Amino acid sequence: HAEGTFTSDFF
């Protein structure tokens, strides 16, 4: 979620 981006919000 923005701050989390796909890298953190992967899967």
Side-chain angles (χ1 to χ4, degrees):
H1 265 246
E3 311 130 21
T5 342
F6 180 90
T7 177
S8 321
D9 300 63
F10 65 99
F11 183 72

